[PDB]
Amino acid sequence: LDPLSETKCTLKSFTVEKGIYQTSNFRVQPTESIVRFPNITNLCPFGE
Amino acid sequence: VSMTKTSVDCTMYICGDSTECSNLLLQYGSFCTQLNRALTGIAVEQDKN
Ligand SMILES: *[C@@H]1O[C@H](CO[C@@H]2O[C@@H](C)[C@@H](O)[C@@H](O)[C@@H]2O)[C@@H](O[C@@H]2O[C@H](CO)[C@@H](O)[C@H](O)[C@H]2NC(C)=O)[C@H](O)[C@H]1NC(C)=O
Numbered sequence: 001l002d003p004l005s006e007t008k009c010t011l012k013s014f015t016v017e018k019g020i021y022q023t024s025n026f027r028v029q030p031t032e033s034i035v036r037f038p039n040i041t042n043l044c045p046f047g048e
Numbered sequence: 049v050s051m052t053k054t055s056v057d058c059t060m061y062i063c064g065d066s067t068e069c070s071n072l073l074l075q076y077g078s079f080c081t082q083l084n085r086a087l088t089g090i091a092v093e094q095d096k097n
Contacts, residue, residue, distance in 0.1 A: 022088060025057045 053091035058083050 006023045007016050058080035063069030073080065 022055070022084065025060065 050094040050097050053094050055087055055091065056083065 003023065004016070007021050008014060010021065010023050059070055059073060062080075063073055
């Protein structure tokens with residue numbers, strides 16, 4: 001919900017003392033997926 | 049008098065960005081929270097010292 005609710009869960013307590021508390025490390029998530037393969041197009045000769 | 053303060057994200061060290069590894073790491077319970085708790089106790093003591 002909010003940084004205080006994350007602090008309550010990280011301390012496993014509904015009440016929190018005066019302090020500074022380590023909570024989950026943040027992370028910028030990926031915006032899109034990029035696929036890069038060679039521009040080879042001809043199928044492989046497996047019948048042979 | 050002091051040493052370098054270090055923090056670790058135990059999940060980013062073990063599993064960095066894999067959700068599959070992160071779901072498997074939850075099977076061990078408290079260990080990563082204990083590791084972060086122990087390094088936090090060391091880091092607060094460098095300022096105390
Ligand atoms: C290897 O052969 C199979 C099937 O055997 C052949 O079937 C005829 C097509 C003819 O060539 C007969 O002399 C052989 O006995 C191939 O399977 C066919 O694949 C196509 C797509 O390429 C598909 O549309 C057909 O429905 C399939 N037919 C059957 C009967 O399965 C298969 O593609 C060949 N393997 C490889 C790796 O090329």
